[PDB]
Design a protein around this ligand. Structure first.
Ligand code: ZN
Lengths: 288, 251, 66, 1340
RNA sequence: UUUGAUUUGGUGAGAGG
DNA sequence: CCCTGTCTGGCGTCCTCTCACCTATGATCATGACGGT
DNA sequence: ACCGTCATGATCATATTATTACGCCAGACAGGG
């Protein structure tokens, strides 16, 4: 509503302002009193899909597990690696970021002391054991689950993890709601992934691949920023380069899909006939 | 069973079975009498629809009804639904040795103990008090003990403080969402009629004190007392199982 | 999906305590299905020890002594 | 000037806006609707006359008989309200109807009937309404609640977005009749037009246009324009109006008059349209490709062959043009089917149609209604004339015809109740216009489309359904009997009418049990706009938008008073000034702001008349004439608030209290509370309980007197005068002579209602509040009710509160209360429980109520009399015997000698077992009232004869005192008349007083008046004779009762519940709380005067739960008590009235331009002392809702008392005796005790009874039951490793019967051990699955 | 060849958390 | 024959507390009150 | 005051019709390019 409620509660609200306030608050009470049914039915579906899964071994005997990286949406690094790899047992032994060192062994639980020795060495990402990669028939082994979470140690042989997991996902169901180009922020080094590129005539490295990931790696080794750069964008920078904080490093036009080339030469109209294939629309306000 | 009065409040299945038997008797009599084809086709069709209405009512076209327009409840409707046997009597049951009252604060408590009223304590612990009274030798038969606690003499409160002492109880707030909503305490007896609940523990139950109610349950057997002390005690739940964050945070 | 996955289980009491009981009981009846209990809600239905918590030693013992 | 009870305690009033329309009578919806229902109403409608003239005359199945209608009449009820609530009857009135039977002859139904008969007939019993606005159905006072539903008429909704998953919106046009078959026109993604009738199968829409006898040529004449092609010598020229060409790209070069107008490849601009219409171009030239797809309108036939050239609604090709060109046709009529302007929806619809004439359309409609049966032309005509076009089965109301004409832009709002052809064609025209892009759709939640039914209209509809069942019965009987020998009471029977109206008032979804524990709760349950019930939506299905406040609830439906939980916004409460329109919509007052001046005339606007005009906000500043003092003023135009100029306004609101309801206008400082906390405050103010001595609100809104007087708990004076006799039972008013009838001499007697049971087990008392010899005015309180005081409304009590954290005992929301509160007996509420005991009739004989009872001794029977019933006054405990009743013996041991009765003793030797029916415990009390009802024929025992003699004696004394008191008033009238005209000063009292008529006086008005008083006196004599005989008949007779019951004993216990840790108290802003510790007096924080504070709240609830109004209420309450303490100081020192007059005048002026303006110079030195006697416990202050007391006025009133300006006193501690740092806030808050007590929720069970079908414990508290260890608790114990706890929690403690008896033996022997077994309810699951064709087992 | 106290069902409406 | 609207079934939160309200009938032997002798 | 006639209450099988106004969301089905 274009006219706000300029009066607080210490000054008096008049009539219209309180009525607009009642719009805004009746919507919230209706949302909670109808949201709670979906939250409870979500907890029910979750504890009946889980319902069976019991910690029933001590090691499945595998070497597979998901690759825990810190998550980065495009702003500053949102959830650090110490939040994701706290108390989860590594899959293979993490190499120290210098060269080929056995920093941690390959079946160690990562409690707070190990995670601090991970944060000192600025470890990139940890290949850690996940429950979906567990090889145990009819249950989850004790290492592929992780830390007990309300006990400091590993999960005991027996403790029902499906039900506590289903409750822990569905329990915050009440608090949840129901109803141009790239500008860098920090100052570091450039790295490109999924890139197949070419240098244009002016010098800005344009990209012949749609799915290119533009990472900003710091001077330490960890990945601090990530972005998605489209097919055919004007990169102000290049691979492995050092930039300044706030300098624009990418540019494109999304309303005009570029059909840029790899080589040079002359242009011919192959199967382009005016009258059937293409049409003649001379511009009104420009003339070109 | 009859309700309070002189008539029998009959179940719906008796209507269903009584109709199937009425129709089956009619069909046997018509096959005795050699009625023509269309009569016994309607008779067997009414029996088919009667059996199909008995088993799963309303899966066929519009369900039959006795009183008044509401359809009557069949066997499959004794199984299925929110109020069948699974979701209403086998997964969740009503429970003896249990109680319920309004909560209040009582901040003098240590966080392994909760306040529990004397009237609820003498009602929930009637068999332990009976066993204690029969051990001392104050009475003889069970009747005498039930008269003693029906009168509430001066000697059963010492018996009650000697059955409480190291015996945990399960406090439970009514919308239990995660496992920290059932926690086991040790009772401390309360002159009053309200459960005194230690304040830090409230942030686990999502329990404010604006009119809330909680249920108490008594672990009867010995393995259940040990599970209440060793797994479900309130000192043992100081970290939320969803993460690593402490749940006994000062509110 | 979670409701299609909990109704497609090898234990028809687990898939009957949940949503529609008509479909699951006819599928289990005409298949002649059998429920080697082996989970939490079958043992909450049938009235015995949970095979997770304290009862996991009891179910180790019973599974060993067959 | 002020009324005499307004000179008792005149409430201080802040407030700035001078009112112009006072609060109306708050119960006008119920009373006005039911007065509209039952009243002798001529000119047909509304009322019962509408039903009796729409279902009658019943004419027979061609037997030439007819049962027509004359009139109706309701006799008096046999039972008045008090006897009806005591005994348990309906409060009904018999409905006598005068019906007439006429019987026509042969060969002339337009001929003379041979015989008529007109007579009185009995049908049904409709329950009357009491003066409070409530019904008494079976001794329990019930309220029928107004329903909010959809307005009958057309409704053009748009199924937006969701269908077909391609964004193409649909448009449907639901015609909503008031009674009959629905009708939904709609579209489909192929842009066809589909009708449907009552949500049945779908047909193309034009099939009904053929059913109204339209040929296809006429249909295309209606729904399209025409395009004319003239074959004139060159390329089949065209008549062209260029308005159709607005933006169309032509296929050639349009030239005319030898001039190129339009080029090929371009479109026709608007200026080219101007050129062609300025030059008046008519005939243009088309190519052969232009009429390649033009759709012909009507049929062309060739004159030679007699065949069809081209059918109607067909595109034209080359060969069709070649055929019609050589047949002699020069004019070609086609249609204009554009992309944006006019789609060919009718044309595609007629191309999907298989039907071709009227008969096939009627056959297809008869076939979609009743599937699979042979149609016949007579049956199809009869069905389609009885769907929409008959007075019987289809009826829009006047509301329906108004909406149907208004939403189609008609002029006359009057029409027939049935549809016609033009109506359906206008619906299809408006639907096609909405699809074309002009015009708008209609929203649902807009209150111009939500009608309000009430008690009268719903009772009329249920009575009409009863009448159509009885017209089925009368049509059955009338032409299947011998005539003339019967009368019209042998035909019509009263069973379906009484069954229908008794089922509606008895158990409906809207005839609900009155929440009666408070005058506020009565007067806000009667004003309720429920959306649920029959014809409306349901809670567990819908929805989102209907639970939201629309912009046109402003001043009709309250935005902040609604129940939170599963139905928010469906159980809306109607506002204060909101009336109901003539049709049923909502309307609200406004003030007609003519061009400069706010004129003080009120003017009621509906919900759609409000939108067109522009309404000024309620609190806009104006300078003594009406001229708006600003030049930008905040207004709202069309559902949207904005800022408008000074003199473009058309209306102003009346008073600033009109957005809110009466539940949430007793909240002081409402504009400072956030709306959630105001909602919770209004709902808990409804949930209060009446205390023992209700005090007053120190900080009210002035709305208390409307809620108290305009409800029915106080004893309002009817005619003013002088009080003659006050008593705790009765009050006698002597009526003043300038208010008094000439005859029926008249002094009124108010019989108050002493201690009796309410519905919520409170104690509805009435206390007399007037002195003796005191004048009272017409319209004035005499007896305060429950939670009233001097005619005000005192729900809870006002106590000294401090906001400080005090050692944790008020942690989340808790409240900490001194023992000074419980010592003063000030929350000690009084509850009354009714305990019934019936004497049924079983086998081996009837029961015994006598006190010769087995298995009991002296200690039980000392509290009973010699006939079983407990005394009146015996203070009992929990588990004594109230009524002794013996029969329980069952069949412990089958009688050896079959039925050996006459052998040992008289009847039997106590069967086999005996146990006098002894009751439970948990509650104390004092037996205040015992009722004994006896089914007639049964021997009355000695106590039933004692109660009969008692009530005979009471009614005898009461009617004799009626005669004596009215005779005393009559003799006082005779003395008042004989002051002049033959006065005898000494001779008047020498003779006996009954002869004051034959004294010396001529034929004047005085001897005429003495003759009229002799007529009145002899009428009172014979009336007293016949009424005492009838009252002896009513006491002496039996009562009709249940099948097979001897006598019913009802006993009223009267518990007095004080306060304890665990009760719920709350203020009036949402500050809830369980009281957590009842401290001693010494521990309370006191101040540097000495007084302890009573209640210590918690400050931390204020910044999060944003209810900042309670702190302003606290400061203004402390100001009020400061003025009260200064009055108490100036009066305790025995000071003369001059200083009291000075100080009271200074405390009543004190403000800005306000409304009160009192002066004590016209109170005359005796009222000022009594006004100060009423002000010494504090000075009451009114603070209206949105025009309240600002901060500076509270500061100036805290400066009048010698209190600190900031409101905060420094407070010492009680324990340490040393000062709290940073001085704390004290004041008075008006706090309410709620009836969620703690000795009604607390429950405990070791081992009780067990259910029958599944061997699990019972549920509830009255049934001694156990708490449900639900499913999520089972999940929470699976989530730990607790396995044995869950095994005993669902096998031993709950279900397995041998397991739990082994458990009970093992617990009382000290061996904690369980033998598990199986749940018996799992065996019930095996039997229910096994009772199907399924074979479930248990292997191994 | 004689020991026993035992059982209160659906439907719909409303409130608390 | 592979997309496709269209129709039919199947979900929709736990725990608790208070109150009221509960199918019609169509046919007949035998008991029960009323009037004549 | 006894005998006969009208009236009125027990027990007992007989077996189903004249409203609409949720919102997805899978899952199966006849239609047609
Ligand atoms: Zn594993």
């Amino acid at each position: 509503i274009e006219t706000p409620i300029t009066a607080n509660f210490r000054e008096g609200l008049n009539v219209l302002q309180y009525f607009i306030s009642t719009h805004g608050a009746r919507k919230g009470l209706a949302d909670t009193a109808l949201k709670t049914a979906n939250s409870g039915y979500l907890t029910r579906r979750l504890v009946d899909v889980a319902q069976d899964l019991v910690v029933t071994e001590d090691d499945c005997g595998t070497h597979e597990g998901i690759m825990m990286t810190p998550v980065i949406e495009g702003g500053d690094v949102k959830e650090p690696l110490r939040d994701r790899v706290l108390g989860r047992v590594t899959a293979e032994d993490v190499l120290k970021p210098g060269t080929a060192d056995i920093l941690v062994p390959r079946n160690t639980l990562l409690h707070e002391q190990w995670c601090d020795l991970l944060e000192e060495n600025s470890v990139d990402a940890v290949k850690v054991r996940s429950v979906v990669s567990c090889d145990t028939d009819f249950g989850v082994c004790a290492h592929c689950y992780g830390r007990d979470l309300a006990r400091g140690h590993i999960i005991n042989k027996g403790e029902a993890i499906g039900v506590i997991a289903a409750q822990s996902i569905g329990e915050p169901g009440t608090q949840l709601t129901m109803r141009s180009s790239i500008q860098v922020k920090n100052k570091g080094s450039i790295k490109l992934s999924n890139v197949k590129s070419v240098v244009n005539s002016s010098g800005k490295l344009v990209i012949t691949s749609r799915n290119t990931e533009l990472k900003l790696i710091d001077e330490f080794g960890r990945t601090k920023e990530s972005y998605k750069v489209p097919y055919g964008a004007v990169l102000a920078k290049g691979d492995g380069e050092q930039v300044a904080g706030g300098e624009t490093v990418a540019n494109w036009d999304p309303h005009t899909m570029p059909v840029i080339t790899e080589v040079s030469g002359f242009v011919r109209f192959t199967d382009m006939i005016d009258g059937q294939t293409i049409t003649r629309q001379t511009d009104e306000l420009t003339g070109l | 069973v009859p309700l309070d009065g002189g008539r029998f409040a009959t179940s719906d299945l008796n209507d269903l079975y009584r109709r199937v038997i009425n129709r089956n008797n009619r069909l046997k009599r018509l096959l005795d009498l050699a009625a023509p084809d269309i009569i016994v086709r309607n008779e067997k069709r009414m029996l088919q629809e009667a059996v199909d209405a008995l088993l799963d009512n309303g899966r066929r076209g519009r369900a039959i009804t006795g009183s008044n327009k509401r359809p009557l409840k069949s066997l499959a409707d004794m199984i299925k639904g929110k109020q069948g046997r699974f979701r209403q009597n086998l997964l969740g049951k009503r429970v003896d040795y249990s109680g319920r009252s309004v909560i209040t604060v009582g901040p003098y408590l240590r966080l392994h103990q909760c306040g529990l009223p004397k009237k609820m304590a003498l009602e929930l612990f009637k068999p332990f008090i009976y066993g204690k009274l029969e051990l001392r030798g104050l009475a003889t038969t069970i009747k005498a003990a039930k008269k003693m606690v029906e009168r509430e003499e001066a000697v059963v409160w010492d018996i009650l403080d000697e059955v409480i002492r190291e015996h945990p109880v399960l406090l439970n707030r009514a919308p239990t969402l995660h496992r920290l909503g059932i926690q086991a305490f040790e009772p401390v007896l309360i002159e009053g009629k309200a459960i005194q609940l230690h304040p830090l523990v409230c942030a686990a139950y999502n329990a404010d004190f604006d009119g809330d109610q909680m249920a108490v349950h008594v672990p009867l057997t010995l393995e259940a007392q040990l599970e209440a002390r060793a797994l479900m005690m309130s000192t043992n739940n100081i970290l939320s199982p969803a993460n690593g964050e402490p749940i006994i945070v000062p509110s | 999906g979670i409701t299609k996955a909990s109704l497609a289980t090898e234990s028809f009491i687990s898939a009957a305590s949940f949503q529609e009981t008509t479909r699951v009981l006819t599928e289990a009846a005409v298949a002649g299905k059998r429920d080697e209990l082996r989970g939490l809600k079958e043992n909450v239905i049938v009235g015995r020890l949970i095979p997770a918590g304290t009862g996991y030693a009891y179910h180790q013992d019973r599974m060993r002594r067959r | 000037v002020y009324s005499y009870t307004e000179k008792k305690r005149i409430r201080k009033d802040f407030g700035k806006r001078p009112q112009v329309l006072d609060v109306p009578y708050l119960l006008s919806i119920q009373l006005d609707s039911f007065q509209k229902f039952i009243e002798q109403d001529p000119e047909g409608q509304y009322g019962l006359e509408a039903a009796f003239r729409s279902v009658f005359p019943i004419q027979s199945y061609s037997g030439n008989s007819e049962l027509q209608y004359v009139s109706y009449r309701l006799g008096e009820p046999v039972f008045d309200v008090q006897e009806c609530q005591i005994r348990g009857v309906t409060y009904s009135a018999p409905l006598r109807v005068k019906l007439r039977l006429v019987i026509y002859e042969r060969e002339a139904p337009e001929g003379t009937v041979k015989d008529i008969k007109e007579q009185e007939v009995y049908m049904g019993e409709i329950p009357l309404m009491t003066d409070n606005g409530t019904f008494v159905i079976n001794g329990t006072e019930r309220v029928i609640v107004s329903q909010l539903h959809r307005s009958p008429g057309v409704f053009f909704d748009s199924d937006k977005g969701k269908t077909h998953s391609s964004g193409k919106v649909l448009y449907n046009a639901r015609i909503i009749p008031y009674r009959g078959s629905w009708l939904d026109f709609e579209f489909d993604p192929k842009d066809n037009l589909f009708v449907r009738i009552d949500r049945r199968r779908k047909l193309p829409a034009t099939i009904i246009l053929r059913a109204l006898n339209y040929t296809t040529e006429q249909i295309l004449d209606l729904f399209f324009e025409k395009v004319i092609f003239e074959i004139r010598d060159n390329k089949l020229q065209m008549e062209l109006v260029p308005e159709r060409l607005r933006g169309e790209t032509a296929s050639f070069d349009i030239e005319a008059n030898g001039k190129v107008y339009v080029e090929k490849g371009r479109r026709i601009t608007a200026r080219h349209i101007r050129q062609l219409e300025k030059d008046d171009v008519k005939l243009i030239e088309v190519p052969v490709e232009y009429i390649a797809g033009k759709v012909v309108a009507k049929d062309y036939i060739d004159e030679s062959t007699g065949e069809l050239i081209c059918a109607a609604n067909m595109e034209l090709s080359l060969d069709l043009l070649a055929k019609l060109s050589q047949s002699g046709h020069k004019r070609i009529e086609t249609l204009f089917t554009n992309d944006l302007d006019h789609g060919p929806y009718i044309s595609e619809t007629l191309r999907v149609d298989p039907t071709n004439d009227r008969l096939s359309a009627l056959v297809e409609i008869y076939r979609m209604m009743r599937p699979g049966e042979p149609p016949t032309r007579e049956a199809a005509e009869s069905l389609f004339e009885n769907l929409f076009f008959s007075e019987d089965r289809y009826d829009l109301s006047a509301v329906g015809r108004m909406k149907f004409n208004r939403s189609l832009l008609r002029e006359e709002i009057e029409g027939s109740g049935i549809l016609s052809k033009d109506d359906i064609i206008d619906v299809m025209k408006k639907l096609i216009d909405i699809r074309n892009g002009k015009g708008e759709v209609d929203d649902i939640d807009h209150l111009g489309n939500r009608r309000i039914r009430s008690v009268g209209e719903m009772a009329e509809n249920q009575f009409r359904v009863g009448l159509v069942r009885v017209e089925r019965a009368v049509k059955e009987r009338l032409s299947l009997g011998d005539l003339d020998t019967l009368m019209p009471q042998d035909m019509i029977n009263a069973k379906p009418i009484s069954a229908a109206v008794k089922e509606f008032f008895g158990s409906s979804q809207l005839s609900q049990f009155m929440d009666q524990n408070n005058p506020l709760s009565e007067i806000t349950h009667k004003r309720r706009i429920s959306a649920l019930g029959p014809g409306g939506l349901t809670r567990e299905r819908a929805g989102f938008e209907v639970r939201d406040v629309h912009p046109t609830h402003y001043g009709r439906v309250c935005p902040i008073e609604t129940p939170e939980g599963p139905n928010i916004g469906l159980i809306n409460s109607l506002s204060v000034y909101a009336q109901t329109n003539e049709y049923g919509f909502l309307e609200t007052p406004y003030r007609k702001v003519t061009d400069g001046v706010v004129t003080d005339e009120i003017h009621y606007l509906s919900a759609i008349e409000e939108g067109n005009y522009v309404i000024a906000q309620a609190n806009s500043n104006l300078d003594e004439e009406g001229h708006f003092v600003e030049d930008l003023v905040t207004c709202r135009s069309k559902g949207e608030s904005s800022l408008f100029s000074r003199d473009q306004v058309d209306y102003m609101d009346v008073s600033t209290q009109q957005v809110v309801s009466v539940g949430a206008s007793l909240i002081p400082f409402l504009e400072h509370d956030d709306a959630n906390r105001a909602l919770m405050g209004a709902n808990m103010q409804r949930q209060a309980v009446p205390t023992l001595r209700a005090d007053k609100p120190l900080v009210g809104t002035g709305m208390e007197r409307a809620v108290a007087v305009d409800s029915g708990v106080t004893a309002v004076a009817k005619r003013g005068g002088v009080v003659q006799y006050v008593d705790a039972s009765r009050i006698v008013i002597k009526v003043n002579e300038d208010e008094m009838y000439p005859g029926e001499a008249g002094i009124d007697i108010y019989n108050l209602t002493k201690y009796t049971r309410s519905n919520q087990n409170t104690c509805i008392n009435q206390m007399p509040c007037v002195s003796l010899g005191e004048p009272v005015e017409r319209g004035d309180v005499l007896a305060d009710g429950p939670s009233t005081d001097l005619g005000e409304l005192a729900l809870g009590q006002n106590m000294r509160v401090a906001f400080m954290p005090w050692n944790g005992y008020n942690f989340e929301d808790s409240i900490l209360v001194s023992e000074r509160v419980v010592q003063e007996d000030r929350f000690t509420t009084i509850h009354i429980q009714e305990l019934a005991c019936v004497s049924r009739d079983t086998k081996l004989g009837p029961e015994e109520i006598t006190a010769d009872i087995p298995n009991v001794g002296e200690a039980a029977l000392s509290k009973l009399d010699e006939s079983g019933i407990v005394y009146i006054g015996a203070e009992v405990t929990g588990g004594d015997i109230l009524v002794g009743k013996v029969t329980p013996k069952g069949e412990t041991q089958l009688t050896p000698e079959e039925k050996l009765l006459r052998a040992i003793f008289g009847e039997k030797a106590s069967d086999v077992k005996d146990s006098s029916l002894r009751v439970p415990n948990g509650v104390s009390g004092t037996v205040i009232d015992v009722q004994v009802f006896t089914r007639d024929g049964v021997e009355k025992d000695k106590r039933a004869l004692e109660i009969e003699e008692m009530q005979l004696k009471q009614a005898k004394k009461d009617l004799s005192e009626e005669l004596q008191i009215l005779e005393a008033g009559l003799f006082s009238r005779i003395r008042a008349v004989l002051v002049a005209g033959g006065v005898e000063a000494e001779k008047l009292d020498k003779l006996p007083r009954d002869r004051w008529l034959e004294l010396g006086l001529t034929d004047e008005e005085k001897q005429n008046q003495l003759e009229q008083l002799a007529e009145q006196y002899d009428e009172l004599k014979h009336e007293f004779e016949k009424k005492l005989e009838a009252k002896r008949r009513k006491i002496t007779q039996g009562d009709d009762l249940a099948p097979g019951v001897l006598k019913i004993v009802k006993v009223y216990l009267a518990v007095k519940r004080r306060i304890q840790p665990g009760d719920k108290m709350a203020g009036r802003h949402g500050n809830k709380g369980v009281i957590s510790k009842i401290n001693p007096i010494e521990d309370m924080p006191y101040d540097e005067n000495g007084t302890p504070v009573d209640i210590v709240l918690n400050p931390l609830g204020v910044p999060s739960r944003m209810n900042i109004g309670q702190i302003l209420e606290t400061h203004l309450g402390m100001a009020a008590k400061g003025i009260g303490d200064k009055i108490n100081a100036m009066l305790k020192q025995q000071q003369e009235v001059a200083k009291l007059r000075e100080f009271i005048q200074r405390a009543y002026d004190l403000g800005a331009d306000v409304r009160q303006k009192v002066d004590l110079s016209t109170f005359s030195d005796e009222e000022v002392m009594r006004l100060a006697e009423n002000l010494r416990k504090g000075m009451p202050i009114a603070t209206p809702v949105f025009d309240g007391a600002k901060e500076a006025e509270i500061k100036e009133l805290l400066k009048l008392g010698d209190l600190p300006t900031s409101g905060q006193i420094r407070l010492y501690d009680g324990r340490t005796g040393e000062q709290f740092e940073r001085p704390v806030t004290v004041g008075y808050m008006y706090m309410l005790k709620l009836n969620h007590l703690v000795d009604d929720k607390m429950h405990a069970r070791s081992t009780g009874s067990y259910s029958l079908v599944t061997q699990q414990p019972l549920g509830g508290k009255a049934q001694f039951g156990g708490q449900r260890f639900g499913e999520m608790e089972v999940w929470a114990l699976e989530a730990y490793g607790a396995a044995y706890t869950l095994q005993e929690m669902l096998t031993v403690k709950s279900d397995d019967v041998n397991g739990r008896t082994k458990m009970y033996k093992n617990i009382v022997d000290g061996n904690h051990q369980m033998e598990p077994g199986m749940p018996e309810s799992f065996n019930v699951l095996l039997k229910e699955i096994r009772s199907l064709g399924i074979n479930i087992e248990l292997e191994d």
